[PDB]
Amino acid sequence: GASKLRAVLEKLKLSRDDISTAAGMVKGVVDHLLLRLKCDSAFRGVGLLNTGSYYEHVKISAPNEFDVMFKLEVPRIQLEEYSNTRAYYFVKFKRNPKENPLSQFLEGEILSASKMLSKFRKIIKEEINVIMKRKRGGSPAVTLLISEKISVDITLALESKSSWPASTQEGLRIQNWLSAKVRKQLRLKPFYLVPKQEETWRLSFSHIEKEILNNHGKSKTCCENKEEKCCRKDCLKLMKYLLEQLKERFKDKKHLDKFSSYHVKTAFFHVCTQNPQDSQWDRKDLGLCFDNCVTYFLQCLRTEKLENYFIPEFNLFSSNLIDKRSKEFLTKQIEYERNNEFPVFD
Numbered sequence: 001g002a003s004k005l006r007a008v009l010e011k012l013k014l015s016r017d018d019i020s021t022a023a024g025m026v027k028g029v030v031d032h033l034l035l036r037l038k039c040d041s042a043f044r045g046v047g048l049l050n051t052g053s054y055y056e057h058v059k060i061s062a063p064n065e066f067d068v069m070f071k072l073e074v075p076r077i078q079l080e081e082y083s084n085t086r087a088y089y090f091v092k093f094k095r096n097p098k099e100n101p102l103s104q105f106l107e108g109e110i111l112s113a114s115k116m117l118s119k120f121r122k123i124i125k126e127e128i129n130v131i132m133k134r135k136r137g138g139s140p141a142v143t144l145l146i147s148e149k150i151s152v153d154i155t156l157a158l159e160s161k162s163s164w165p166a167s168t169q170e171g172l173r174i175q176n177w178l179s180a181k182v183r184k185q186l187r188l189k190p191f192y193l194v195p196k197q198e199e200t201w202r203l204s205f206s207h208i209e210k211e212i213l214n215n216h217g218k219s220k221t222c223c224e225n226k227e228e229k230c231c232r233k234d235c236l237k238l239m240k241y242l243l244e245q246l247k248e249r250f251k252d253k254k255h256l257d258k259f260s261s262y263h264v265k266t267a268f269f270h271v272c273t274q275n276p277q278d279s280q281w282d283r284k285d286l287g288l289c290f291d292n293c294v295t296y297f298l299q300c301l302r303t304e305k306l307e308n309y310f311i312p313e314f315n316l317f318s319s320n321l322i323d324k325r326s327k328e329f330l331t332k333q334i335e336y337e338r339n340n341e342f343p344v345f346d
């Protein structure tokens with residue numbers, strides 16, 4: 001019922017909580033890079049962005065993939081919304097102390113992402129002497145390979161400590177779950193701008209995940225004792241692992257390339273909004289809770305609808321982001337695993 005799932009989670013526990021020297025290796029590369037970066041005229045205000053710190057992941061199946069975020073404090077920033085995309089913006093400056101650190105990447109009044117990534121990647125490429133990966137880039141920006149296994153996706157982010165853009169006004173619908181006072185508190189935190197043709201930056205709220213995952217119940221005491229243990233975290237882990245295993249089962253094909261743990265996180269958090277009560281997430285009901293996550297995500301692929309959790313009008317499952325053929329393929333593959341007691345969980 002929930003027995004196979006529990007054992008999958010027991011297997012996953014014996015690799016994470018099991019002495020992973022991987023994170024400590026990643027930390028050493030990042031510390032060395034930040035020191036070099038802070039000596040540059042444009043990157044003197046650089047710093048590690050805590051998304052769980054150095055050990056921020058994507059791959060829950062294999063510790064062979066880490067995702068790190070660097071932040072740059074960009075003050076008195078003016079944002080121009082590109083083509084009413086709601087998520088993509090141009091970065092312009094108020095121009096008070098004109099000769100500012102990032103004035104070297106300006107193309108008129110607009111701040112260039114490719115030219116900022118150019119210097120960033122160049123400084124990292126020479127600081128390596130750990131192997132770099134030219135491959136594609138863009139987003140995730142720099143991709144390093146520690147030894148022969150560990151892969152680290154470094155993303156540079158513009159930090160704005162001002163009110164969140166108007167596109168987010170109806171996003172973060174946590175009022176009936178985490179409360180209206182928590183939503184207000186989270187919305188006082190900064191927002192980030194990441195690169196990815198035009199020199200546009202998308203809004204990133206990745207730092208908010210940790211805030212919510214570590215304090216995820218309607219009850220303030222959720223998972224702090226015996227009678228209040230919920231399966232929300234276990235459902236997220238199983239949803240991530242499902243996509244990761246499906247992405248392995250078809251790694252010789254192009255169909256599941258556009259899908260990430262991000263699509264899985266977003267849909268999981270929309271299930272959280274839909275099911276705000278801790279009783280809708282009981283440990284005993286792990287099987288049905290996971291099914292709700294699986295069902296919601298299938299209804300997402302089928303309708304080509306998965307709204308950005310912070311930007312309701314930005315659709316992560318639009319035809320311009322992922323095609324019908326890739327959505328209809330993953331729909332069949334999940335429906336298969338669901339109708340066979342999940343074979344990837346063997």
Ligand SMILES: Cc1ccc(-c2cc(C(=O)O)c3cn(Cc4ccccc4)nc3c2)c(Cl)c1
Binds near residue numbers: 051205208
């Ligand atoms: C309640 C809640 C909070 C945050 C997110 C979220 C939001 C974003 C974003 O960009 O907006 C995310 C982007 N990554 C991938 C990533 C993360 C760190 C470093 C590199 C790459 N993971 C995210 C999670 C979601 Cl979906 C829900």
Ligand SMILES: [Zn+2]
Binds near residue numbers: 217222223228229230
């Ligand atoms: Zn809980």
